[PDB]
């Protein structure tokens, strides 16, 4: 079963009276092959429930859950955002995913009201279809659980090239990517995902496209939509992306920087290109980075690992004072430790009877977790 | 800022319970005055209207709504043809607490009414009598029940963990047993003025703890779930005489009569009787289930022209049904039975599948009507037969003499039943512990009396342990703050040998008041090992963060062994 199920927009201005059909109030919906009656029924029921709860509680609802589905709903003016999830997914993950979709739409098409008042529906619908295709192609289990980014003397000069760019006139931050692999970045992780997921489909191979940054991200770049320009340059394997300013539409400055190093970057690139006994997962709260050791094939043991983290990840976000938590069932035990900097989860891939014996191996996982993980460079404090 | 509402499919209100804040908010909103029930209905009509369409179309219903920061929580549950709505707006209760409260209210409805609750048509009339005074009285009684349940859940550990607590005194318990035997059950039975009522059980209650209990030789053992409801009902009337009340408990839901006679402040006596027409309910229950199987195969199976007549279940049901009809001979039910007999068993013109469905439904309602006419209109609160006033006074006066000298000691011992100091020497670093046996439903825990800080942490461990158990986790160790929590589950046998652990099924709320989950768990394990007895045990402990984890496990294991040796 797909974790992401439904996503559509409803406009309450076009449908104000009872006799007004709700079919015209649907701007986009996925999948596009669904029937019209189900679309109308779902939109009407969701809109009515949201309006009634908002009237009763003087505040719009943010979560509607059913026996088999789970809807995340947010209100932006007269437009309503609805997200389709599965039961197994955590609520916070769905809320973050919906926020990510809204941020992508705002950074890619600007304000919703102006975009729908000025632009046509078909082009935005095609863009939405392509972007949904990309997002569905780029989703994994640990990405579902934690919602992280899709991520050494050579790196020093790779970052030095960007450093020489920041000084180059009117530069806030920049990043260098290789086929979705981050080489060096300075942007905040929220906008780094937007730049990375930008499908890279005048001097040759030079494109400039305006974007819209929220004030919080705009302040972070400088340290409620603000117009900026994105410099996209397509190399054989490399891409260079810079957000500079609104009147960018300097010249010949960034042009010289790439052509002073193109023969060195690709040459350096080609040089670079040319039975686990335990499972672990390390998550960084500051940089939103994820690293773990799981096989591409989902074994029955791996499936039980993902379920255990699901409850424990949500428990930490609700109790800031909780530090240590361990669980055990008839087949496995998983250990966890949390600090305001990082989190750690450990399980041994290698049956309890009666009251637990103090010499039980499941209760001794604390000592093994700190020693085993030091091999792969995971430094546990 | 709390509200519990029960509504039908037509947005009709049957029961409501609101506090001062909710009433004031509704007055402020609608005052810019009609009845509160009308205001609640006209405010919550859209939710009820929209909920039914979802079930009709996509076979799904809403379960919960959430606002930002959890300011307002809405819980919806469909119990047959009725909708249950719980609203919270003060962050004092969670979704699980609201669901548990709804299930407790539904269990209270079951206990108060019986098999009638299964039929959605009769329960609507029962909860909303045409008379205004009776409706107001019933609503006030149910509101008082909800309030006392909420108070007991927040003040007593017995309802916090849903387990039975007993006062341990070997000398007093025996004398209580002989006193009860000689002067309560025998006194009622030997009196010719009992009017056909048979005494079965009688127990003495001090505060929220049980002291003595006895049962007759012709009485069945009470389930631990029912006695918690009995304790709640006793506590409602006399917080820490009223006429008898008709109650229904699982033996079906056979009728029973409740008597409550207070002796002192905090000491109460409870007596239960049984109507001589009790086993008629068992026949009605069998007929109620028998027609359900007939209707089940009428829809799923093929043309009922000949297949059903060869089914032994239909013949067994017919053998049960015709005996009931001949024994009663009621004209209203005999004419319909003859009509259904012709439809079902005519060799010439068998009834159609659509026609037989309506015929079976008509017979279902008539059986419930007989139950209503027999075991609810003859309630003692409506002029029904009951024990005479002077007979009750004799029992109340005579029992006081036997316990006159033990009044002061009982109150002091109740507040100091178990001393933590007695276990501090053997188990250093221990703060609080709860030992619960899931086979007999009995709990062993000290009396908690800095005191508030440890008291609050007790509920946090209980709530977390129940949440993790639902998805197949049998143990949980976690540290929050300066205290270390624990939770252990294991299976043993009658002789005390260790038993192997199996996979707990992954998921009704976990508890004993509003249903049961442990009885079904024991049966599941017994399916694979029928040759060995099964026992269930639980243990909750609290320790300081200074004690290491390895030392904590050994300390916890020794405590369980000592309690096991101390018991039995």
């Amino acid at each position: 079963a797909s974790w992401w199920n439904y996503f559509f927009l409803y406009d309450g201005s076009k449908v104000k009276e009872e006799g007004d059909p709700t079919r015209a109030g649907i701007c986009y919906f996925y999948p596009s092959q669904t029937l019209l009656d189900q679309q109308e029924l779902l939109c009407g029921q969701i809109a009515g429930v949201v309006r009634c709860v908002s009237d009763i509680s003087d505040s719009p609802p943010t979560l509607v859950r059913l026996r088999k589905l789970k809807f995340a709903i947010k209100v932006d003016g007269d437009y309503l955002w609805v997200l389709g999830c599965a039961v197994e997914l955590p609520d916070v993950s769905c809320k973050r995913f919906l926020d990510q979709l809204v941020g992508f739409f705002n950074f890619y098409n600007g304000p919703v009201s102006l975009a729908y008042e000025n632009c046509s529906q078909e082009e935005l619908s095609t863009e939405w279809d392509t972007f949904i295709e990309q997002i569905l192609k780029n989703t994994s289990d640990l990405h579902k659980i934690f919602n992280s980014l899709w991520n050494p003397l050579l790196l020093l000069k790779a970052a030095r090239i960007l450093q020489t760019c920041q000084r180059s006139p009117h530069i806030l931050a920049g990043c260098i990517l290789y086929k979705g692999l981050i080489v060096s970045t300075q942007l905040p992780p929220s906008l780094t995902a937007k730049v990375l997921l930008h499908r890279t489909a005048l001097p040759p191979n030079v494109q400039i496209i305006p974007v819209f940054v929220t004030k919080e991200e705009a302040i972070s770049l400088h340290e409620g939509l603000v117009r900026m320009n994105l410099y996209t340059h397509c190399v054989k394997g490399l891409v260079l992306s810079l957000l500079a300013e609104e009147p960018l539409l300097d010249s010949a400055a960034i042009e010289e920087v790439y052509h002073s190093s193109l023969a060195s970057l690709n040459g350096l690139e080609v040089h670079l290109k040319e039975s686990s006994t335990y499972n672990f997962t390390h998550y960084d709260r500051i940089q939103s980075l994820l690293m773990a050791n799981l096989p591409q094939v989902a074994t029955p043991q791996d499936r039980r690992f993902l379920q255990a983290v699901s409850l424990m990840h949500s428990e930490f976000a609700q109790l800031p004072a909780l530090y240590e938590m361990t669980v055990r069932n008839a087949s496995t035990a998983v250990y966890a430790c949390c600090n305001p900097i990082q989190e750690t989860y450990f399980q041994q891939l290698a049956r309890s009877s009666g009251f637990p014996n103090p010499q039980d191996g499941a209760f001794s996982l604390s000592g093994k977790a700190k020693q085993k993980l030091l091999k792969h460079g995971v430094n546990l404090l | 800022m709390k509200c519990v509402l029960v509504a039908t499919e037509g947005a009709e209100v049957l029961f409501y319970w609101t506090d001062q804040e909710f009433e004031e908010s509704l007055r402020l909103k609608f005052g810019q005055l009609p009845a509160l029930e009308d205001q609640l209905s006209t405010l919550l009509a859209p939710v009820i209207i929209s909920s039914m369409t979802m079930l009709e179309k996509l076979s799904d219903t809403y379960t919960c709504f959430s606002t930002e920061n959890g300011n307002f929580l809405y819980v919806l549950h469909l119990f047959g043809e009725c909708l249950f709505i719980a609203i919270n707006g003060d962050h004092t209760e969670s979704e699980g607490d609201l669901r548990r409260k709804l299930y407790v209210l539904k269990y209270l409805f079951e206990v108060h009414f019986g098999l009638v609750t299964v039929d959605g048509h009769l329960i609507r009339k029962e909860l909303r009598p045409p008379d205004l005074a009776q409706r107001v009285q019933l609503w006030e009684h149910f509101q008082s029940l909800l309030w006392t349940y909420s108070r007991l859940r927040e003040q007593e550990q017995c309802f916090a963990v849903e387990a039975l607590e007993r006062l341990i005194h070997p000398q007093l318990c025996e004398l209580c047993i002989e006193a009860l035997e000689r002067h309560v059950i025998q006194a009622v039975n030997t009196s010719p003025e009992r009017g056909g009522e048979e005494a079965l059980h009688a127990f003495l209650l001090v505060h929220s703890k049980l002291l003595a209990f006895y049962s007759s030789h012709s009485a069945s053992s009470l389930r631990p779930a029912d006695l918690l409801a009995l304790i709640l009902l006793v506590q409602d009337l006399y917080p820490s005489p009223s006429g008898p009340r008709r109650i229904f408990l699982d033996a079906p839901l056979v009728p029973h009569t409740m008597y409550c006679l207070p002796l002192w402040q905090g000491i109460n006596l409870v007596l239960l009787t049984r109507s001589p027409s009790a086993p008629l309910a068992l026949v009605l229950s069998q007929l109620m289930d028998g027609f359900s199987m007939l209707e089940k195969k009428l829809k799923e199976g093929p043309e009922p022209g000949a297949s059903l007549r060869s089914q032994p279940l239909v013949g067994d049901l017919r053998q049960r049904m015709d005996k009931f009809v001949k024994n009663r001979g009621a004209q209203e039910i005999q004419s319909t039975w003859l009509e259904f007999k012709a439809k079902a068993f005519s060799k010439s013109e068998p009834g159609s599948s659509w026609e037989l469905l309506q015929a079976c439904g008509k017979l279902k309602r008539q059986l419930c009507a007989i139950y209503r006419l027999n075991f609810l209109t003859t309630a003692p609160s409506r002029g029904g037969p009951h024990l005479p006033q002077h007979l009750q006074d004799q029992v109340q006066r005579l029992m006081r003499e036997k316990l006159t000298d033990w009044k002061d000691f009982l109150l002091v011992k109740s507040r100091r039943n178990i001393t933590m100091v007695s276990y501090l020497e053997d188990f250093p670093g221990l703060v609080h512990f709860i030992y619960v046996d899931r086979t007999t439903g009995q709990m062993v825990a000290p009396s908690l009396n800095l005191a508030a800080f440890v008291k609050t942490k007790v509920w946090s461990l209980i709530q977390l342990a129940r949440r993790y158990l639902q998805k197949g986790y049998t143990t949980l160790l976690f540290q929050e703050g300066d205290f270390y929590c624990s939770y252990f589950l294991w299976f043993e046998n009658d002789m005390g040998y260790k038993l192997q652990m199996i996979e707990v099924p992954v998921l009704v709320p976990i508890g004993m008041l509003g249903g049961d989950y442990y009885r079904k768990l024991l049966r599941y394990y017994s399916k694979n090992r029928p040759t060995e007895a099964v026992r269930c045990y639980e243990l909750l402990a609290l320790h300081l963060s200074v004690i290491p984890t390895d030392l904590l496990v050994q300390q916890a294991g020794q405590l369980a062994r000592r309690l096991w040796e101390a018991s039995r």
Side-chain angles (χ1 to χ4, degrees), chain B residues 295-568:
Chain B
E295 277 203 0
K296 191 166 179 169
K297 53 178 172 285
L298 270 164
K299 293 182 183 293
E300 296 165 348
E303 295 195 334
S307 62
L308 279 71
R309 295 175 186 168
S310 54
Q311 296 200 220
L313 196 143
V314 186
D316 191 18
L317 181 63
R318 171 184 171 154
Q319 190 173 356
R320 291 180 195 206
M321 187 66 204
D322 63 358
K323 188 180 182 181
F324 173 82
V325 172
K326 187 178 180 182
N327 284 8
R328 183 175 292 276
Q331 290 185 340
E332 206 180 48
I333 204 165
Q334 187 171 354
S335 61
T336 45
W337 174 235
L338 288 165
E339 189 203 332
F340 178 74
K341 258 185 153 184
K343 286 172 168 178
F345 305 102
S346 175
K347 286 188 177 185
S348 48
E349 290 170 334
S352 296
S353 58
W354 186 84
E355 281 167 74
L356 286 175
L357 280 165
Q358 277 72 242
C360 290
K362 290 174 182 177
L363 275 162
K364 186 180 289 293
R365 292 183 291 113
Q366 293 179 176
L367 289 166
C368 287
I370 297 170
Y371 186 11
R372 197 197 163 230
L373 193 140
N374 276 356
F375 304 147
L376 260 178
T377 338
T378 70
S381 52
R382 299 178 176 160
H386 60 284
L387 293 175
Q389 187 53 45
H390 63 317
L391 199 43
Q392 301 183 43
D393 297 341
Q394 184 178 2
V395 178
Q396 194 182 33
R397 188 270 299 164
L398 183 63
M399 283 284 309
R400 274 187 178 139
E401 289 171 5
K402 291 292 179 181
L403 291 176
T404 301
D405 304 328
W406 293 66
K407 189 264 183 181
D408 291 327
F409 177 77
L410 267 170
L411 286 172
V412 173
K413 174 72 161 43
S414 158
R415 183 65 60 84
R416 291 154 208 66
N417 184 26
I418 309 178
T419 52
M420 186 49 255
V421 175
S422 60
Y423 296 93
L424 288 180
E425 297 188 314
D426 295 293
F427 312 102
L430 185 63
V431 176
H432 195 74
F433 69 103
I434 302 181
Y435 184 77
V436 177
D437 190 0
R438 284 321 179 165
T439 299
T440 78
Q442 295 184 43
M443 65 179 288
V444 182
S447 83
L448 75 166
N449 292 297
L450 183 52
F453 193 88
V454 65
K455 181 179 176 195
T456 307
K457 294 272 311 173
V458 167
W459 281 286
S460 180
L461 176 54
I462 297 164
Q463 184 187 2
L464 210 66
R466 286 172 164 160
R467 185 172 174 189
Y468 270 83
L469 172 43
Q470 194 171 349
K471 293 182 183 293
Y473 298 105
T474 58
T475 186
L476 181 62
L477 314 182
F478 76 98
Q479 180 187 161
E480 163 199 6
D482 301 312
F483 292 89
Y484 204 103
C485 288
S486 85
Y487 159 68
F488 294 90
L489 181 68
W490 71 88
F491 292 94
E492 293 182 356
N493 59 358
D494 288 340
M495 187 66 204
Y497 295 104
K498 301 226 203 179
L499 293 185
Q500 200 183 57
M501 182 66 97
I502 59 159
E503 299 196 346
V504 174
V506 179
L507 306 182
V508 296
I510 284 173
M512 184 175 49
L513 196 148
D516 213 316
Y517 169 69
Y518 301 109
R519 292 184 295 169
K520 292 177 70 68
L521 184 59
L522 295 173
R523 198 180 168 168
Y524 172 59
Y525 182 45
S526 296
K527 192 186 191 178
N528 300 350
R529 284 190 168 137
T531 54
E532 289 196 282
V534 186
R535 300 291 272 278
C536 183
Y537 284 110
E538 290 181 353
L539 181 67
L540 304 180
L542 187 75
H543 291 85
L544 285 172
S545 179
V546 192
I547 297 169
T549 74
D550 50 301
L551 179 63
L552 189 142
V553 182
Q554 188 173 340
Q555 183 180 181
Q558 284 176 344
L559 180 66
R561 169 173 276 178
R562 178 184 176 170
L563 287 175
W564 174 61
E565 289 170 13
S567 56
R568 275 173 180 231

Side-chain angles (χ1 to χ4, degrees), chain A residues 56 62-63 65 324-326, chain B residues 29 60 63 66 468 477 479:
Chain A
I56 297 169
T62 67
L63 199 75
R65 174 211 290 91
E324 183 178 1
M325 185 180 288
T326 187
Chain B
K29 287 184 179 194
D60 206 356
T63 55
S66 290
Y468 270 83
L477 314 182
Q479 180 187 161

Side-chain angles (χ1 to χ4, degrees), chain A residues 38 41-42 44-46 48-49 52-53 55-69 71 91 95 304 307-309 311-315 318-319 321-332 351-359 363 366, chain B residues 29 43-44 46-47 49-51 53-54 57-69 71-72 74 87 95 464 467-468 471-481 484 488-492 498-504 549-550 553-554 557 560-561:
Chain A
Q38 187 177 6
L41 175 86
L42 273 169
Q45 293 304 320
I46 290 297
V49 167
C52 168
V53 182
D55 295 334
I56 297 169
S57 66
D58 302 314
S59 292
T62 67
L63 199 75
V64 169
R65 174 211 290 91
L66 292 88
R67 309 191 78 158
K68 303 167 181 167
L69 290 178
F71 289 108
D91 303 356
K95 288 179 189 188
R304 291 164 181 199
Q307 288 167 336
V309 188
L311 302 82
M312 271 145 68
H313 180 60
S314 81
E315 281 280 348
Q318 293 179 356
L319 277 296
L322 190 151
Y323 294 137
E324 183 178 1
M325 185 180 288
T326 187
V327 306
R328 175 191 61 170
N329 57 28
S331 66
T332 186
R351 282 183 174 178
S352 49
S353 60
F355 62 96
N357 215 1
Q359 60 95 32
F363 284 10
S366 297
Chain B
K29 287 184 179 194
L43 193 84
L44 281 153
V47 175
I49 293 166
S50 312
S51 181
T53 309
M54 271 314 297
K57 304 302 177 188
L58 294 175
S59 299
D60 206 356
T61 59
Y62 311 128
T63 55
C64 181
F65 309 136
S66 290
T67 318
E68 72 261 17
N69 293 311
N71 277 343
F72 270 74
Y74 295 73
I87 312 180
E95 180 208 44
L464 210 66
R467 185 172 174 189
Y468 270 83
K471 293 182 183 293
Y473 298 105
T474 58
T475 186
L476 181 62
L477 314 182
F478 76 98
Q479 180 187 161
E480 163 199 6
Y484 204 103
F488 294 90
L489 181 68
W490 71 88
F491 292 94
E492 293 182 356
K498 301 226 203 179
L499 293 185
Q500 200 183 57
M501 182 66 97
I502 59 159
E503 299 196 346
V504 174
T549 74
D550 50 301
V553 182
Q554 188 173 340
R561 169 173 276 178

Side-chain angles (χ1 to χ4, degrees), chain A residues 56-288:
Chain A
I56 297 169
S57 66
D58 302 314
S59 292
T62 67
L63 199 75
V64 169
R65 174 211 290 91
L66 292 88
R67 309 191 78 158
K68 303 167 181 167
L69 290 178
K70 176 172 97 181
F71 289 108
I73 306 177
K74 64 162 311 203
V75 185
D76 193 7
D78 295 319
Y79 298 96
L80 195 76
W81 296 94
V82 176
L83 172 71
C85 288
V87 176
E88 304 194 337
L89 275 152
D91 303 356
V92 186
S93 296
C94 291
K95 288 179 189 188
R96 263 170 213 150
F97 192 58
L98 182 59
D99 266 7
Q100 282 175 344
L101 274 295
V102 178
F104 283 20
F105 187 34
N106 286 10
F107 182 76
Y108 290 161
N109 281 137
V112 65
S113 56
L114 274 49
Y116 292 167
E117 279 172 358
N118 290 284
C119 293
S120 75
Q121 186 174 9
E122 299 193 348
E123 290 156 313
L124 279 71
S125 75
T126 57
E127 160 186 4
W128 266 115
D129 272 9
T130 293
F131 274 40
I132 300 299
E133 277 204 346
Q134 184 178 2
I135 297 169
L136 279 178
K137 188 173 184 177
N138 284 359
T139 309
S140 86
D141 297 326
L142 278 182
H143 293 123
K144 276 192 315 297
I145 301 299
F146 285 103
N147 197 357
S148 66
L149 304 182
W150 291 270
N151 55 355
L153 301 180
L154 313 186
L155 304 184
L156 294 174
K157 64 179 72 175
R160 188 175 179 192
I161 287 163
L162 279 172
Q163 287 172 343
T164 307
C165 293
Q166 262 89 75
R167 309 159 207 168
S168 123
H170 311 302
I171 296 291
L172 299 182
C175 68
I176 285 182
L177 294 174
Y178 181 76
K179 295 181 184 292
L181 283 72
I182 309 161
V183 190
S184 186
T185 181
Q186 286 76 60
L187 281 72
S190 65
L191 183 63
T192 307
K194 290 170 182 191
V195 189
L196 187 138
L197 284 181
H198 172 60
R199 189 177 275 196
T200 58
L202 290 178
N205 314 308
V206 172
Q207 293 82 17
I208 303 184
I209 300 173
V211 293
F212 296 86
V213 294
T214 187
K215 190 174 183 177
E216 281 67 34
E217 281 178 322
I219 289 163
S220 78
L221 294 174
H222 291 114
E223 278 192 343
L225 276 298
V226 183
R227 301 181 35 75
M228 293 180 183
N229 259 134
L230 179 69
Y231 182 76
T232 70
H233 182 74
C234 280
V235 190
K236 315 196 196 104
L238 192 142
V239 293
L240 179 70
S241 302
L242 272 299
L243 289 174
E245 290 180 353
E246 72 275 16
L248 187 70
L249 294 174
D250 57 279
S251 293
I254 298 160
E255 183 65 25
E256 193 189 309
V257 176
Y258 157 80
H259 291 88
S260 61
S261 66
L262 73 165
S264 298
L265 282 172
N266 59 2
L268 187 153
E269 188 276 330
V270 298
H271 274 287
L272 274 174
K273 188 175 174 181
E274 204 76 14
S275 66
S276 71
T277 59
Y278 62 99
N279 292 344
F280 81 101
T281 300
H282 176 262
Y283 180 69
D284 198 333
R285 294 182 144 196
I286 296 186
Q287 305 199 5
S288 295

